[PDB]
Design a protein around this ligand. Structure first.
Ligand SMILES: Cc1cc2nc3c(=O)[nH]c(=O)nc-3n(C[C@H](O)[C@H](O)[C@H](O)COP(=O)(O)O)c2cc1C
Ligand SMILES: Cc1cc2nc3c(=O)[nH]c(=O)nc-3n(C[C@H](O)[C@H](O)[C@H](O)COP(=O)(O)O)c2cc1C
Ligand SMILES: [Cl-]
Ligand SMILES: [Cl-]
Lengths: 233, 233
């Protein structure tokens, strides 16, 4: 074994926190972990907004779809794509290529996952909040983001006050392909649907996820990004 | 606040030179298991991994990544992909062409990849992300036989390290982390960091990153994604 692996494998989203704050030294370490993430071309295109102002916390909770743990978490971090630093160094920077939004999205996930694992390694718990993107522009303006930047997701951190079971995922032989993409075996989806309702014990996982994707998935996001100068071509 | 997870995170270096020693089957199983334990937006599970063991494809991928020889010499090479094809194979009604979903695919891929890499690093392995595959995304896509609704994002080399670089410094936290609202860049923080990086090595950092972003960044990538059915609106 080792403690990093058991930390990774014991992951659960935590959505209920005690009122205990996170020590100043733990938070410094969590952010230090984030900053040690790999970075495409060393561009360093991620910014983090730490929200301590409780009026802003309450507004973010509402913008995220009334997720109360946005308010009650000890800390709330907002991960943002940031090409404003670069444009402030050299205004010829071309930040509107879709490639650069891919980079900002991937690098944000890498950094955020270092932050979360570092926190979980210390007995803390957390959850990602993609719900900020429901009202992306309102969140953007609330945190004062300039052009060439955009919100991607938030992250709640705190001392956990709940003990969920680990949720199973699709098996590695479904998700991992050897040398070339393998067509899906629908029997593996049926076996996994069974695993999920065992976990949850009417819609099965397969019906829920494809029900969600049959509709429109935040169709305001490309205009939002375009409005900040991003993903225009 | 210091355990071996934190120690692994902060001790991270990109490794680009590997010994010939293979990775044990048990270790690779654990690395992939660690990736599968990552958070997933809405439990969509939008990520696939192609593990490339065929040496001719390894050679081709090395070329397509920009002649990066460690693609070929790494013990294992993993290609991370956005995957909405599992969902469309479940229900052809799924709408996978929203930009929102490429965004989810990219973030979730970085989260999963970083679980894999940290797991590897915790075992004394090393590795490096290979975004260079996107230089030739379409040819890489055809080589791995990806269907519609999937797209490569980046690769990942893993192996037993045969170099030990020093840990490379990042922008300071007080530049990257903002309290409550976005903060303007102080160009003297860039000047300081430019000197910190010049020491690390011997164009400054800021000249190199901006002059790179002054050009076009992989302008073929939006057509690449659109040709796979993604990011069209
Ligand atoms: C990018 C991203 C955004 C997320 N956004 C939310 C959110 O807005 N609200 C929420 O409750 N959970 C959110 N989650 C948490 C997922 O629902 C959770 O990871 C998933 O259900 C699997 O559960 P687990 O993390 O406990 O293993 C998000 C996860 C990711 C990766
Ligand atoms: C998304 C992504 C793609 C990357 N692609 C490459 C690559 O193609 N070639 C390479 O040598 N390094 C690649 N890297 C590694 C970066 O060059 C590296 O993280 C940074 O320059 C080096 O800092 P480090 O030693 O702290 O990781 C990539 C990193 C990320 C996050
Ligand atoms: Cl957690
Ligand atoms: Cl890259």
């Amino acid at each position: 074994m080792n403690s990093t692996i058991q930390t990774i494998l014991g992951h659960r989203s935590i959505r209920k926190f005690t009122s205990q704050p996170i020590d100043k030294e733990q938070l410094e370490t969590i952010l230090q972990a984030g900053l040690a993430a790999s970075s495409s071309s060393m561009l360093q295109v991620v910014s983090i907004v730490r929200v301590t102002d409780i009026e802003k916390r309450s507004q973010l909770a509402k913008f995220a779809g009334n997720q109360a743990y946005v308010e009650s978490a000890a800390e709330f971090l907002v991960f943002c794509i940031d090409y404003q630093r670069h444009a402030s160094i050299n205004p010829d920077v071309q930040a509107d290529f879709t490639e650069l939004m891919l980079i900002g999205a991937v690098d944000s996930g890498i950094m955020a996952q270092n932050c979360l694992l570092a926190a979980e390694s210390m007995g803390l718990g957390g959850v990602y909040i993609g719900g900020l993107r429901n009202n992306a522009q309102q969140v953007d303006e609330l945190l004062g983001l300039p052009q060439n930047t955009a919100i991607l997701f938030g992250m709640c951190l705190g001392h956990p006050d709940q003990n969920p079971e680990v949720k199973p995922r699709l098996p590695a032989h479904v998700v991992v392909h050897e040398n070339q993409y393998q067509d899906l075996n629908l029997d593996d989806i049926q076996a996994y649907d069974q695993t999920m309702q065992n976990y949850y014990a009417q819609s099965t996982w397969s019906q829920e996820v494809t029900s969600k994707l049959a509709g429109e998935s935040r169709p305001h996001i490309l205009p939002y990004l375009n409005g900040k100068g991003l993903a225009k071509k």
